[model samples]
Target: RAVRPTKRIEFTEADGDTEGKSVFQLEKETDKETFKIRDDNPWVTVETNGAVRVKKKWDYEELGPEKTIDFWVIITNHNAGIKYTDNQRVIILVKDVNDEPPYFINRPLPMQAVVQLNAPPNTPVFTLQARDPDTDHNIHYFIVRDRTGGRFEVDERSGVVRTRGTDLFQLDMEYVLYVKAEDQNGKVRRFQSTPEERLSIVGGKRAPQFYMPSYEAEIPENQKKDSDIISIKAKSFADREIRYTLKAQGQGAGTFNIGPTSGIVKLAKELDFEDLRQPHVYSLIVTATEDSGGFSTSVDLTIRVTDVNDNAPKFELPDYQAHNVDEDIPLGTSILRVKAMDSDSGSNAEIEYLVSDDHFAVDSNGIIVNNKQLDADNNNAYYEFIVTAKDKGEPPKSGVATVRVYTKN
Candidate 1:
């Protein structure tokens, strides 16, 4: 039958408590509520184990940084219906500490390392060193804030920065990396004062790229007279020079004259669609020659040539038919109607009727020398003439349509 230890009571002792009284007293039957046991519902127990006694409470509101407060505990229990207690004491003190800033071993540490712009994610780049002036235990993890779309990361302990594997250089030409050091207090004291020594990590570079011209073409109907010249605009790394050569076989009979230094190509002669040997696709191989004797990737240029209706109408007649005839054939009669077809559409397709010297006008439908009675004895009976039918093209592109005057007498 072991007896139960007396209930104990303990409370905090601060500077304010000592200022008023040297000793604190509590009547018997006292107990303390220990917050550590259960905050809201503190544990009720005696600070000391003994018979009846008095306990004291202290105040520490005015305690200084270098000073402290004394706390005490009281023990008590009911003995044969009599409330009794004992007393004990403990002490706690607040101390002064340094608030100095931390530092990095090598601020702006310039060290270059190669990084495969196409490397896998989380690839290690480099490391940094840092320390806290207050104490080594005060140093905390490192961090990086400015990154692409919130990318880039650093090891908290080693201050090692590596790729998040998103491959930023894949999308951009270059990149700037930033890393930071922090103290246990969550403060970046090292970089706070020395901004000039700011950490800058730059390493990766974008793969070499070459530039080329856009596709170009023009229809024959849009071609100017004796003015057909097509050029190729080129692009490549600054260190490289580009050159172009003809590819299409349908570019007429002459060779394309090209600028040796500049990639400009021009035709030696006019283009003709009748030349079946001419090729539509002009494959211009763009070779990039670099100063280092290295040639960049070559690209094939597919220059397409569009056709236009520029050829004139060919007449079916070998020569103009002119003769005299008389028969009372009456006026407003059909003699001959000229017919022409245009490869071009719309206004380019319309042809006009014409007769030289106004010898019997050709009608709108190209009906020339209307059926009329020839006065077998008149000079008008047999008239010399030349007729023509011209296209309604803007420049009035035209063709010859001859309807000779004939007399049936």
Candidate 2:
């Protein structure tokens, strides 16, 4: 009933073709026939109803420079002899889909982007840059995650970083900043930069300065490997790079390792409260120095290990023996006593005692006494048993003491 449309068909992206959208419908054949597309393409489809549809969302940037899809549509008639058919060639051109984020060309800004000394306040000192493959779209650049002492600003349009203070560039000053660019469509899927060791403003020389004056953290003894400690950081002014190193002090030696470039401080191994030397506090010093400038500064850090129920009560002596005691002297007589000491404090160190035989029992004070009077040389010559000392620690710990009794008639 209709002639084939033009062989070359093209459609702009986002024109209802890439969104499960039907681009166009064709007139059907007079007689019964089926329409099908040649070549299994992932981008477009021709339905039996003569409708041309989009098989997937199309993006010009991802399609390379050609930006074209080639396929053929076959129309066939059945139940009459063999068949009569019509075929048409097609090359669909997809144009301009804004799908790319503007990324910074010079990523990871220079090690030391300088701000001139005696430069006027609010003057432009540095300009960042970005490039977007997506054509004909404006970009809005901005500054975020500002970790400075609030002394810098950025122009949203030009991406120019400027100083915020009127005091001009100090002798030695530095800060860190992050920059990103977003297209009109708000596509910021990528392209962010951080000056990990940059943004220094000075005349000639300056040492490193930490964002915070000092750093501190607390961790329990025997912390799992997943628990981390501190991440120390610093920045400096001038056109230079900064490197970090860790110094363990006092009782904290051989306990931690720090990243030279990343400044991440983590435990080399676990810590123990009972084994941690006197005072039970860990001290450390982190220093940041310029790679080429030879200038540096340091910060003091401390980590405190809290208490845990980790110690057990131990018997003071190997054995307790009382010999040559007269039998039948007294009932409920205190026969022998034992002592146990603990390395832990508080409830973890308190000790209680228990004797093995029912004929004798031990009290909380480590005193062992007999319930029935003893008779020697009649049935039993001596008494030998065990004494247990348990602490009040969590799940508790135990120590044992052996006791022996000798009697004469």
The TM-score leader among the candidates is 2
Report the number of backbone clashes for model 2.
1
Q: How do the residues 195-307 of candidate 1 rate in per-residue lDDT, one tens digit apiece? A: 22333343442222334323354435234443535554544323345554444434433434555566565555555544556665555554444444444444454545555
Badly placed stretches (over 4 Å) of model 1 are 1-208, 217-246, 249-257, 273-276, 279-285, 289-291, 300-312, 322-325, 337-350, 356-373, 376-380, 398-403
Candidate 2, 113: how far from true, in Å?
A: 12
**Model 2, span 137-196: residue lDDT tens:** 666766666766666887887878887876655545555676566677534355323222
The C-alpha lDDT values of all candidates are 0.47, 0.71
- Model 2: runs farther than 4 Å from truth? 1-115, 118-121, 124-206, 220-228, 236-241, 248-252, 268-272, 275-279, 307-310, 329-331, 375-378
Q: What TM-score would every model get versus the actual structure?
A: 0.41, 0.49
